[PDB]
Structure 1
Amino acid sequence: GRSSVRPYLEECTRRFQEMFDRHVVTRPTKVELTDAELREVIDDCNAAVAPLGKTVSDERWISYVGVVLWSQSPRHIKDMEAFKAVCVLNCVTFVWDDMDPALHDFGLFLPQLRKICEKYYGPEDAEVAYEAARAFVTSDHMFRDSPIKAALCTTSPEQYFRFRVTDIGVDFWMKMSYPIYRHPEFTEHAKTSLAARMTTRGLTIVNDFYSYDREVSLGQITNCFRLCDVSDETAFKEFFQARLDDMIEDIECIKAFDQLTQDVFLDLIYGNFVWTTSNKRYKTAVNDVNSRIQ
């Protein structure tokens, strides 16, 4: 009844895309990694999660990494070592997101994050990236079955998106991504988390729509469509339009930022959507790339 948004899949996909075409216009661009670059990334990912004891397949890594390939801003890239770092860090904390909390070993995993950060970044940037990775994995862990999560995800969209600034990983993403661009304004917006606060709703509403069926099946409550009656087409449509309006208002305000920063913000939101709709992770509730790692 409320267990699926499948009836709305085609209409909502078309409405998301129309919104992007009218308000962002320019398509996101996929970063093409060389084979050598992709192997270096996947090798670092496997090394980082090996102490945790679970095998991750190449195609699951590729499912995770696609968000970085599609949602950065390739024409503004300056530092491909920072880009590779974001690939690795994004992927290995994605595994953490998918893991049963019994597998979460901070003593084994935190040094791996530190190693990744020092390898690919300079001394100061490595500290910023590591703290943000540390804060993300700690947050994902401590909020599993937390009353705080229950209160923030069941009260209002406002409370929910406030939780997601950290929990969807976008604050972490900004703080590990600014070395890719070496653009002083973007670096400040990343470090104040204004960059994350501006892009949270656009990332989260899309992720939530397409991951609803999986999350509802697993008992995960971190999803804004749980705030509406999805079995009621009229109530769903009103809620979905309110969320579309949220995304538009953010995008229109993002266009007040400097031309480079606004490119990075918009490529992030629109790229996430392109990646989400072509990724098997977001298609069936349980499959070989989104199954709980138990």
Structure 2
Amino acid sequence: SSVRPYLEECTRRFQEMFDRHVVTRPTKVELTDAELREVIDDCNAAVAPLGKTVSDERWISYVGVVLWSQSPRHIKDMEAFKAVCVLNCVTFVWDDMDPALHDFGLFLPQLRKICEKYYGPEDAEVAYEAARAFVTSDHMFRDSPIKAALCTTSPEQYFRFRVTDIGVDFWMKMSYPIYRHPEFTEHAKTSLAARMTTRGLTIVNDFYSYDREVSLGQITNCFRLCDVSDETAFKEFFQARLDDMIEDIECIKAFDQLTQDVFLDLIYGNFVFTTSNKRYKTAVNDVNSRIQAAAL
């Protein structure tokens, strides 16, 4: 199936939800041309050992999510920002890669290289460990019975899987050096930061990446828990997910002012990234195609 029928009303329902509960719109980070090419050179170098080329356009697509979903008001360290740019893009290639291409012995050293270039010694270890856990999870769970069980049982089992699998725990553990805000750093390191933002990021991503994933046999998507064919059941389910996002956003506002800005800019920036970026406008295209092995 597909959710294109619902695409227009749901975008509006999302946007109305954000306009009431978040209000402040996200704003896109503009990189200088130098900065952008540093990022892209760093990206190509990290995936090169894996034997696949990535166009400058596919990198700019990936990087949009970081340009839209950080918190410019509070940025203090732009070297850390660039690291998140590079780390997020290259793990995007991994997510799209056939597992045959997953070579840990070749790719884990490049991840460490990136982390040691942009972070101090401590932050580099934190970012690296989170990058390593993320690519290792994506690998381990292709065709895992665990993934099956967690994705088909209930929303509560599914979002639990997604704390790691969608990459938000990774994101927080590499983004906290951007802000050098002590409270935020601690919520990143306990993963409470990821836990608070997982549903807002996943429900949005799931709706707009449903068609791609479903075409590719990918089960990691909460709308597979309902009959998107049944208009009534889809509406009941969509509302419960919106309810989920609203409850999360309202608790987020108990966090200190800077932390809540970063959390809410992330959820909302990701919705803007996802509704505008080319990755999510069609199932298979030049920036979201499966990176295939190609046998012989």
TMscore range, shorter length: over 0.9
Q: CA deviation at 1:248?
A: 0.2
> How far apart, in 2, do the equivalents of 1:195 and 1:29 lie?
21
Task: Please give the alpha-carbon distance, in whole angstroms, between the structure 1 residues aligned to 2:76 and 2:174.
Answer: 14
**Does the alignment pair 1:90 with 2:88?**
yes
- Structure 1 residue corresponding to 2:276, chosen from 262, 278, 281: 278
Question: 1:145-198: CA deviations, max 9, x gaps?
Answer: 000000000000000000000000000000000000000000000000000000
Corresponding pairs, count: 292
Q: Could you list the per-position Cα deviations for residues 20-75 of structure 1 after superposition, in whole angstroms to 9, with x for gaps in the alignment?
A: 00000000011110000000000000000000000101111011000000000001
Provide the rounded CA distance (Å) in 2 between the counterparts of 1:227 and 1:57: 35
Shift of 1:241: 0.2
1:148 pairs with one of 128, 146, 149: 146
Aligned partner (choices 187, 190, 194) of residue 189 of structure 1: 187
Compute the displacement of 1:222 (Å). Answer: 0.1
Question: What CA deviation, in whole Å up to 9, does each residue of 1:200-229 have, x standing for no partner?
Answer: 000000000000000000000000000000
Identity of matched residues, %: 100
* Cα deviation 1:98-142 (Å, max 9, x = unaligned): 000000000000000000000000000000000000000000000
Match of 1:116? 114
Using the alignment, how far apart are the partners of 1:205 and 1:255 within structure 2? 19
Provide Cα deviations, 1:237-291, integer angstroms capped at 9, x if missing partner.
Answer: 0000000000000000000000000000000000000000001110111111110
**Distance of 1:284 and 1:24 partners within structure 2:** 28
Paired residue secondary structure (1:144): coil
SS of residue matched to 2:25: coil
TM-score (norm. length: structure 1): 0.99
Match of 1:174 among 172, 175, 185: 172
| Equivalent runs, 1:1-294 vs 2, <5 Å | 3-294=1-292
In 2, Cα distance between equivalents of 1:143 and 1:63: 25
Q: Stretches of 4+ moved more than 3 A in 1?
A: none
Take 2:238 and 2:213, find their aligned partners in 1: how far apart are those partners? 18
CA distance in 2, matches of 1:21, 1:285: 28
Output the aligned Cα RMSD: 0.3
Q: Distance in 1 between the 2:205 and 2:233 partners?
A: 20
- Alpha-carbon distance in 2 for matches of 1:280, 1:87: 18
Q: Could you tell me how far apart the structure 2 residues matched to 1:282 and 1:229 are?
A: 21
* Distance in structure 1 (CA, Å) of the matches to 2:123 and 2:85: 16
DSSP 3-state at the match of 1:126: helix
SS in 1 for 2:45: helix
Q: Secondary structure at the match of 1:288?
A: coil
Residues in 2 aligned to 1:40 and 1:75: alpha-carbon distance in whole angstroms = 23
* Alpha-carbon distance in 1 for matches of 2:186, 2:215: 39
Unaligned runs of 5+ in 2: none
- Deviation per residue, 1:10-29 (Å, 9 max, x gap): 00000000000000000001
Paired with 1:279 and 1:233, the residues of 2 have a C-alpha distance of 27
In 2, Cα distance between the equivalents of 1:116 and 1:141? 20
CA distance in structure 2 between the partners assigned to 1:167 and 1:190 by the alignment: 16
Distance 2:237 2:83 in 1: 37
